[PDB]
Write an enzyme that holds these catalytic residues in place. Structure first.
Site, mmCIF file in Angstrom:
data_model
loop_
_atom_site.group_PDB
_atom_site.id
_atom_site.type_symbol
_atom_site.label_atom_id
_atom_site.label_comp_id
_atom_site.label_asym_id
_atom_site.label_seq_id
_atom_site.Cartn_x
_atom_site.Cartn_y
_atom_site.Cartn_z
ATOM 1 N N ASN A 9 0.866 -1.240 -0.091
ATOM 2 C CA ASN A 9 -0.022 -0.127 0.037
ATOM 3 C C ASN A 9 0.848 1.150 -0.020
ATOM 4 O OD1 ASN A 9 -1.865 2.130 0.311
ATOM 5 N ND2 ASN A 9 -2.636 1.317 2.357
ATOM 6 N N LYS A 11 0.054 4.305 -0.131
ATOM 7 C CA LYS A 11 -0.383 5.415 0.377
ATOM 8 C C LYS A 11 -0.515 6.850 -0.471
ATOM 9 C CE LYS A 11 -0.201 3.350 5.097
ATOM 10 N NZ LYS A 11 -0.164 3.425 6.151
ATOM 11 N N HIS A 95 -9.683 0.536 4.607
ATOM 12 C CA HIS A 95 -8.293 0.944 5.411
ATOM 13 C C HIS A 95 -8.458 1.850 6.647
ATOM 14 C CE1 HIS A 95 -4.234 2.608 6.130
ATOM 15 N NE2 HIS A 95 -4.082 1.147 5.698
ATOM 16 N N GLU A 97 -6.967 4.593 7.859
ATOM 17 C CA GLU A 97 -6.951 6.001 7.597
ATOM 18 C C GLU A 97 -8.232 6.432 6.883
ATOM 19 O OE1 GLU A 97 -3.219 5.519 5.326
ATOM 20 O OE2 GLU A 97 -2.282 4.975 7.064
ATOM 21 N N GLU A 166 -5.276 -5.358 10.596
ATOM 22 C CA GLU A 166 -4.212 -4.165 10.701
ATOM 23 C C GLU A 166 -4.561 -3.471 12.219
ATOM 24 O OE1 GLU A 166 -4.177 -2.178 6.651
ATOM 25 O OE2 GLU A 166 -2.500 -3.211 6.877
ATOM 26 N N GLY A 172 2.117 2.322 10.981
ATOM 27 C CA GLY A 172 2.952 3.442 10.917
ATOM 28 C C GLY A 172 3.546 3.833 12.485
ATOM 29 N N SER A 212 3.332 -2.224 10.570
ATOM 30 C CA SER A 212 4.637 -2.196 10.604
ATOM 31 C C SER A 212 5.560 -3.344 10.402
ATOM 32 C CB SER A 212 5.031 -1.650 12.249
ATOM 33 O OG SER A 212 4.351 -0.684 12.494
#
Lengths: 250, 252
Positions: A9, A11, A95, A97, A166, A172, A212
């Site tokens: 991904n 992003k 996702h 985000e 996730e 991140g 991560s």
């Protein structure tokens, strides 16, 4: 006999020059042929990135999102019909985000999944608990509800679905789940599928881990019996590291 | 004043295929277009490279993104940044479109940050404002559009050279209920006065204020005659290449 699956991904990252360099390293690398490989550029870079792939049958491309509806008056959105028109095979939906930054709900995500699958796309469907949910012991309550809402409510055929677990606290942050933490969730997710959908769907649905993942932690994660691969964010921008993760079982 | 170049933008929204966009661009390539019109078309992001590749007079018609995010590149799955638009050579971006405000919850504050960052990256910005049907019948039209312009640009922005203001009353977007030439001119003149008193006479005299909301080949010539209307942001009618040609030629 679930095929190992590694997604990248990217992003909101990339330039024509950095993407060319990334794809070229992917082109030249030795990749485990038993790994299904998908990379997700920003939409405006999807045609360029695919055009640079030397072996388009061996690495597939994904959109990072699409809207719920057929084409219409939704300035700024990309539709699943457009993905189909462009022959883009995959799409990431739900996702973290989108959920946390853009407010996308379980209900909106459920409609995106159903419409994308109805347009012939393959879906990476993302779920995961927050740090506070994890510390308060709500992990399985949260991720079971997310799968029920995003897929089990509306979907009959799971053939073209991959589940991405996730945990939000691992995205991140430099804080990967331990293999025991991740295996625990994946096994409980597969048991949920077995009892609430069917044993055939539980046996065949890939459940991949994200948050991560990098070259130095992927090998111990990939040994876990219910982890079928990875969704890779930051490390997917570093081509040699993404190659090592593709090769996590070698 | 009157040194503002006529501006016509086509917002294709979430519409298009390889086949349909090829056709529409080829028609625009073929057409006789008034050279006094600045023409911009906004394809969905994933068709932006294809559309620009088929544009013959790449100087005569330019391309725009329909949105971008507030920040430099980072962990924002599903977003496009202003620096990507700069990397790819996209000159224009639409910001603050009503659909982003109403369907996707984009706020005055978010849009103002998008506008500043886009301008900082050398982009040109079509900045969209407009009041709802309820706001107009409550008599709040000018209160709304003045606040929207004050937050979206007047705050963080000092150079307006690359800003085009698009006034699109929500009740006119996609409804078939175009604003009358009188209705549109009244808001545009009041917006231009706001700019004169709250920014500078120079900014008021030079900034294009375009009208959007059900513009079509039949209603564009009467709107284009109004003194404070500097052009159009065209939605549905921009997918119909012959009608979009006529709107580009509304001052002929």
């Amino acid at each position: 006999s679930r095929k190992f699956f590694v997604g990248g991904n990217w992003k909101m990252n990339g330039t024509l020059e950095s993407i060319k360099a990334l794809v070229e390293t992917l082109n030249s690398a030795q990749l485990d042929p038993n790994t299904e490989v998908v990379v997700a550029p920003p939409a405006i870079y999807l045609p360029f990135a695919r055009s640079k792939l030397k072996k388009p049958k061996e690495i597939q491309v994904a959109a990072q999102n699409c809207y719920t509806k057929p084409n219409g008056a939704f300035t700024g959105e990309i539709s699943a019909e457009m993905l189909k028109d462009l022959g883009v095979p995959w799409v990431i939906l739900g996702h973290s985000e989108r959920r946390t930054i853009f407010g996308e709900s379980d209900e909106l995500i459920a409609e995106k999944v159903k419409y994308a699958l109805d347009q012939g796309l393959k879906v990476i469907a993302c779920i995961g608990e927050t740090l506070e949910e994890r510390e308060a012991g709500k992990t399985m309550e949260v991720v079971a509800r997310q799968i029920l809402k995003a897929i089990a409510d509306k979907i009959k055929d799971w053939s073209n679905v991959v589940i991405a677990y996730e945990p939000v606290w691992a995205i991140g942050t430099g804080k990967v789940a331990t293999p025991e933490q991740a295996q625990e969730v994946h096994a409980a997710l597969r048991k949920w599928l077995k009892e609430n959908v069917s044993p055939e769907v539980a046996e065949s649905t890939r459940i991949i881990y994200g948050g991560s993942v990098n070259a130095a932690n992927c090998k111990e994660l990939a040994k876990q019996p219910d982890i079928d691969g990875f969704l890779v964010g930051g490390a997917s921008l570093k081509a040699p590291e993404f190659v090592d993760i593709i090769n996590a079982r070698q």
